Amino acid sequence: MILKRAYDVTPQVRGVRKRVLIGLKDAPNFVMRLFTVEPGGLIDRHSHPWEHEIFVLKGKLTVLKEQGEETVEEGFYIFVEPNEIHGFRNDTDSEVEFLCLIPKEGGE
Amino acid sequence: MILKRAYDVTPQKISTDKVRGVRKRVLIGLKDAPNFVMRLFTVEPGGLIDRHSHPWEHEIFVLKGKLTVLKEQGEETVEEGFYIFVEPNEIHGFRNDTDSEVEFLCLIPKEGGE
Ligand SMILES: [Os+3]
Ligand SMILES: [Os+3]
Fold first, then answer.
1. A20 C-alpha to center of ligand 1: Å?
2. β-pair type (A60-64, A86-89)
3. HSE on the CB side for B82, CA within 13 Å?
4. Can you list the positions of beta strands (E) in A6-104?
Protein backbone atom coordinates (compact mmCIF):
# COMPACT_ATOMS: atom_id res chain seq x y z
CA MET A 1 0.00 0.00 0.00
CA ILE A 2 1.09 3.51 -0.98
CA LEU A 3 -0.13 6.46 1.10
CA LYS A 4 1.05 9.90 0.01
CA ARG A 5 0.13 13.57 -0.16
CA ALA A 6 -0.71 14.28 -3.81
CA TYR A 7 1.08 17.65 -4.18
CA ASP A 8 4.45 16.05 -3.40
CA VAL A 9 4.44 14.12 -6.67
CA THR A 10 6.67 15.67 -9.33
CA PRO A 11 4.66 16.85 -12.34
CA GLN A 12 5.27 15.58 -15.85
CA VAL A 13 -1.59 22.61 -22.84
CA ARG A 14 -0.87 25.99 -21.22
CA GLY A 15 -0.58 26.83 -17.52
CA VAL A 16 -1.03 23.23 -16.42
CA ARG A 17 0.66 20.99 -13.96
CA LYS A 18 -0.01 17.30 -14.54
CA ARG A 19 0.87 14.86 -11.74
CA VAL A 20 0.68 11.12 -12.26
CA LEU A 21 -0.19 10.03 -8.72
CA ILE A 22 -0.77 6.34 -9.39
CA GLY A 23 0.88 5.35 -12.66
CA LEU A 24 1.33 2.06 -14.45
CA LYS A 25 4.60 1.82 -12.52
CA ASP A 26 2.43 0.61 -9.65
CA ALA A 27 -1.09 -0.01 -10.95
CA PRO A 28 -2.16 -2.72 -13.42
CA ASN A 29 -5.30 -1.28 -15.05
CA PHE A 30 -5.69 2.49 -14.82
CA VAL A 31 -3.87 5.67 -13.86
CA MET A 32 -4.66 8.48 -11.40
CA ARG A 33 -3.55 11.97 -12.46
CA LEU A 34 -3.95 15.29 -10.68
CA PHE A 35 -4.23 18.40 -12.88
CA THR A 36 -3.71 21.91 -11.55
CA VAL A 37 -4.80 24.58 -14.03
CA GLU A 38 -3.54 28.10 -13.34
CA PRO A 39 -5.79 31.10 -14.00
CA GLY A 40 -6.17 31.35 -17.76
CA GLY A 41 -4.76 27.85 -18.31
CA LEU A 42 -5.90 25.59 -21.13
CA ILE A 43 -6.05 21.98 -22.25
CA ASP A 44 -6.91 22.17 -25.96
CA ARG A 45 -9.84 20.27 -27.41
CA HIS A 46 -8.72 16.81 -28.42
CA SER A 47 -9.70 13.20 -29.02
CA HIS A 48 -8.18 9.96 -27.75
CA PRO A 49 -9.39 6.36 -28.09
CA TRP A 50 -9.82 5.93 -24.34
CA GLU A 51 -12.15 7.29 -21.64
CA HIS A 52 -11.62 9.83 -18.89
CA GLU A 53 -13.05 9.72 -15.39
CA ILE A 54 -12.72 13.11 -13.70
CA PHE A 55 -13.50 14.61 -10.32
CA VAL A 56 -13.33 18.38 -9.88
CA LEU A 57 -11.56 19.09 -6.59
CA LYS A 58 -11.26 22.87 -6.58
CA GLY A 59 -12.58 25.86 -8.49
CA LYS A 60 -14.72 26.41 -11.56
CA LEU A 61 -13.74 24.44 -14.65
CA THR A 62 -14.81 25.32 -18.18
CA VAL A 63 -15.40 22.09 -20.07
CA LEU A 64 -14.88 22.39 -23.80
CA LYS A 65 -17.17 20.16 -25.86
CA GLU A 66 -17.63 19.18 -29.50
CA GLN A 67 -19.90 22.19 -29.70
CA GLY A 68 -19.94 24.85 -27.01
CA GLU A 69 -18.88 24.64 -23.39
CA GLU A 70 -20.21 24.04 -19.89
CA THR A 71 -18.91 25.26 -16.55
CA VAL A 72 -18.69 22.86 -13.60
CA GLU A 73 -17.40 23.33 -10.07
CA GLU A 74 -15.78 21.47 -7.20
CA GLY A 75 -17.75 18.33 -6.40
CA PHE A 76 -18.68 17.55 -10.01
CA TYR A 77 -17.61 14.38 -11.75
CA ILE A 78 -17.16 14.02 -15.50
CA PHE A 79 -17.20 10.97 -17.71
CA VAL A 80 -15.74 11.33 -21.19
CA GLU A 81 -16.33 8.34 -23.46
CA PRO A 82 -13.57 7.19 -25.82
CA ASN A 83 -13.08 9.47 -28.83
CA GLU A 84 -15.44 12.18 -27.53
CA ILE A 85 -14.08 15.68 -28.09
CA HIS A 86 -13.10 17.45 -24.88
CA GLY A 87 -10.88 20.20 -23.56
CA PHE A 88 -10.61 22.27 -20.34
CA ARG A 89 -10.07 25.95 -19.59
CA ASN A 90 -9.70 28.05 -16.45
CA ASP A 91 -11.71 31.22 -17.04
CA THR A 92 -11.33 32.34 -13.41
CA ASP A 93 -8.88 34.23 -11.20
CA SER A 94 -8.30 31.14 -9.08
CA GLU A 95 -6.48 27.82 -9.40
CA VAL A 96 -8.57 24.93 -10.66
CA GLU A 97 -7.77 21.35 -9.71
CA PHE A 98 -9.21 18.05 -10.92
CA LEU A 99 -8.49 14.34 -10.63
CA CYS A 100 -8.39 12.53 -14.00
CA LEU A 101 -8.14 8.78 -14.47
CA ILE A 102 -7.51 6.91 -17.71
CA PRO A 103 -7.18 3.20 -18.55
CA LYS A 104 -3.78 1.63 -19.21
CA GLU A 105 -4.13 2.09 -22.97
CA GLY A 106 -3.78 5.84 -22.43
CA GLY A 107 -0.36 5.48 -20.82
CA GLU A 108 -0.12 8.34 -18.33
CA MET B 1 -19.96 13.23 -21.88
CA ILE B 2 -21.55 13.17 -18.43
CA LEU B 3 -21.18 16.18 -16.09
CA LYS B 4 -22.96 15.85 -12.74
CA ARG B 5 -22.73 16.78 -9.06
CA ALA B 6 -21.40 13.80 -7.11
CA TYR B 7 -23.68 14.42 -4.13
CA ASP B 8 -26.75 14.18 -6.39
CA VAL B 9 -26.09 10.45 -6.79
CA THR B 10 -28.23 8.67 -4.21
CA PRO B 11 -25.99 7.18 -1.51
CA GLN B 12 -26.66 3.60 -0.44
CA LYS B 13 -26.24 2.53 3.17
CA ILE B 14 -23.58 -0.16 3.44
CA SER B 15 -24.17 -2.59 6.28
CA THR B 16 -22.43 -5.96 6.59
CA ASP B 17 -20.62 -7.98 9.23
CA LYS B 18 -17.50 -5.97 8.35
CA VAL B 19 -18.93 -2.55 7.43
CA ARG B 20 -20.83 -0.15 9.69
CA GLY B 21 -21.66 3.54 9.38
CA VAL B 22 -20.82 3.88 5.69
CA ARG B 23 -22.65 5.18 2.64
CA LYS B 24 -21.56 4.67 -0.97
CA ARG B 25 -22.25 6.47 -4.24
CA VAL B 26 -21.45 4.97 -7.63
CA LEU B 27 -20.52 8.08 -9.61
CA ILE B 28 -19.29 6.43 -12.80
CA GLY B 29 -20.41 2.83 -13.05
CA LEU B 30 -20.38 0.04 -15.60
CA LYS B 31 -23.44 1.51 -17.30
CA ASP B 32 -21.03 3.99 -18.84
CA ALA B 33 -17.47 3.00 -17.99
CA PRO B 34 -15.79 0.23 -19.99
CA ASN B 35 -12.87 -0.47 -17.63
CA PHE B 36 -13.11 0.90 -14.07
CA VAL B 37 -15.61 2.40 -11.64
CA MET B 38 -15.62 5.63 -9.59
CA ARG B 39 -17.21 5.44 -6.14
CA LEU B 40 -17.54 8.04 -3.40
CA PHE B 41 -17.62 6.73 0.18
CA THR B 42 -18.91 8.62 3.19
CA VAL B 43 -17.84 7.31 6.59
CA GLU B 44 -19.83 8.62 9.54
CA PRO B 45 -18.09 9.34 12.85
CA GLY B 46 -17.13 6.00 14.36
CA GLY B 47 -17.72 4.20 11.07
CA LEU B 48 -15.67 1.19 10.04
CA ILE B 49 -14.73 -0.65 6.90
CA ASP B 50 -12.97 -3.50 8.63
CA ARG B 51 -9.89 -5.23 7.27
CA HIS B 52 -10.50 -7.35 4.18
CA SER B 53 -8.95 -8.27 0.85
CA HIS B 54 -10.11 -8.71 -2.74
CA PRO B 55 -8.33 -9.84 -5.91
CA TRP B 56 -8.41 -6.32 -7.36
CA GLU B 57 -6.70 -3.01 -6.59
CA HIS B 58 -8.07 0.19 -5.10
CA GLU B 59 -7.14 3.72 -6.14
CA ILE B 60 -8.27 6.23 -3.52
CA PHE B 61 -8.27 10.00 -3.14
CA VAL B 62 -9.32 11.54 0.16
CA LEU B 63 -11.81 14.39 -0.32
CA LYS B 64 -12.72 15.45 3.21
CA GLY B 65 -11.48 14.85 6.74
CA LYS B 66 -9.00 12.54 8.42
CA LEU B 67 -9.14 8.88 7.34
CA THR B 68 -7.60 6.19 9.53
CA VAL B 69 -6.17 3.51 7.28
CA LEU B 70 -6.03 -0.03 8.60
CA LYS B 71 -2.98 -1.70 7.09
CA GLU B 72 -1.84 -5.33 7.04
CA GLN B 73 -0.33 -4.44 10.41
CA GLY B 74 -1.20 -1.33 12.40
CA GLU B 75 -2.73 1.89 11.13
CA GLU B 76 -1.83 5.27 9.63
CA THR B 77 -3.87 8.44 9.27
CA VAL B 78 -4.22 10.40 6.05
CA GLU B 79 -6.27 13.48 5.24
CA GLU B 80 -7.82 15.47 2.42
CA GLY B 81 -5.40 15.63 -0.49
CA PHE B 82 -3.81 12.22 0.12
CA TYR B 83 -4.05 9.36 -2.34
CA ILE B 84 -3.84 5.66 -1.58
CA PHE B 85 -2.93 2.74 -3.82
CA VAL B 86 -3.91 -0.71 -2.53
CA GLU B 87 -2.44 -3.68 -4.41
CA PRO B 88 -4.72 -6.60 -5.27
CA ASN B 89 -5.07 -9.08 -2.38
CA GLU B 90 -3.51 -6.69 0.16
CA ILE B 91 -5.26 -6.44 3.54
CA HIS B 92 -6.79 -3.04 4.16
CA GLY B 93 -9.59 -1.30 6.03
CA PHE B 94 -10.69 2.23 7.00
CA ARG B 95 -12.00 3.90 10.16
CA ASN B 96 -13.33 7.34 11.05
CA ASP B 97 -12.06 8.36 14.49
CA THR B 98 -13.22 11.98 14.12
CA ASP B 99 -16.45 13.77 14.96
CA SER B 100 -17.35 14.67 11.37
CA GLU B 101 -18.03 12.73 8.16
CA VAL B 102 -15.03 11.61 6.11
CA GLU B 103 -15.25 11.25 2.34
CA PHE B 104 -13.03 9.58 -0.22
CA LEU B 105 -13.06 8.62 -3.87
CA CYS B 106 -12.40 4.91 -4.46
CA LEU B 107 -11.88 3.40 -7.90
CA ILE B 108 -11.77 -0.29 -8.77
CA PRO B 109 -11.40 -2.18 -12.05
CA LYS B 110 -14.58 -3.67 -13.53
CA GLU B 111 -13.79 -7.17 -12.22
CA GLY B 112 -14.52 -5.80 -8.75
CA GLY B 113 -18.05 -4.76 -9.73
CA GLU B 114 -19.46 -1.47 -8.41
OS1 LIG C 1 -8.19 13.86 -22.91
OS1 LIG D 1 -11.35 -3.03 -0.25
1. 14
2. antiparallel
3. 19
4. 14-22, 30-46, 52-58, 60-64, 69-73, 76-80, 86-89, 96-103
Asked if residues B92 and B51 have their Cβ atoms less than 8 Å apart, the reply is yes
Instruction: Tell me the technique behind this structure.
Output: X-ray
The structure was resolved to a resolution in Å of: 1.1
Question: In CATH, what number does A1-108 get?
Answer: 2.60.120.10
Q: Which ligand sits closest to the CA of B92?
A: 2
Rounded Cα gap, residues B6 and B4, in angstroms: 6
Of the bound ligands, which one is closest to the alpha carbon of residue A107?
Answer: 1
B105 closest CA partner among B14, B42, B22: B42
DSSP category for residue B99: S
- Indicate the burial class of A95 (C-beta count within 10 angstroms; 0-12, 13-18, 19 or more): middle
CATH architecture, domain defined by B1-114: Sandwich (2.60)
Closest to B107 (Cα-Cα) out of A28, A56, A101: A101
Sign of CA dihedral A70, A74, A75, A81: positive
Give the total residue count for chain A: 108
Nearest residue of chain A to residue B70 (CA atoms): A1
A and B: number of Cβ contacts within 8 A = 108
